[PDB]
């Protein structure tokens, strides 16, 4: 891990930006994945899956 | 070097949690859904005499 250490951990200012980037990108990656599991576990039960949606007289 | 990499992973989450809790309190002061539900309508009016104004 020392090659990684030499680019990011040497200065705290970079290492702080590394933690902010990982907070951003890590949070987005979990958001997408949790939503994909929810879609796959609830097939057909969504609002866009109402067959007569838009056809109320 | 391995230790600092392992610690940064948990540091991603602490920052994410801190951001989420701060933004929850901030946006709770924003306009509520009922308030936003009364922001568009039309009203009609008539005619008034010269040199005067009506509010």
């Amino acid at each position: 891990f020392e090659g990684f250490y030499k680019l990011i951990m040497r200065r705290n200012s970079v290492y702080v930006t590394f933690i902010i980037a990982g907070a951003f990108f890590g949070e987005r990656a979990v958001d997408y994945g949790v939503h994909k599991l929810w879609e796959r576990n609830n097939v057909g039960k969504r609002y866009e899956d109402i067959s007569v949606l838009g056809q109320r007289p | 070097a391995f230790a600092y990499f392992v610690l940064s992973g948990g540091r991603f989450v602490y920052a994410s949690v801190l951001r989420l809790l701060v933004l929850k309190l901030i946006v709770s002061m924003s306009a509520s859904k009922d308030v936003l539900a009364l922001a568009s309508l039309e009203v009609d009016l008539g005619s008034i005499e010269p040199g005067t104004t009506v509010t």
Partner: peptide, 28 residues
């Protein structure tokens, strides 16, 4: 000649943080 580098590196940290707390992608 490092104080200018520490300033530039902490400004990048400040800019990344600002884009992170407020995420104005819809406004850019």
């Amino acid at each position: 000649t490092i104080d200018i580098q520490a300033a530039a590196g902490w400004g990048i940290a400040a800019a990344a943080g600002a884009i992170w707390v407020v995420q104005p992608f819809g406004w850019i």
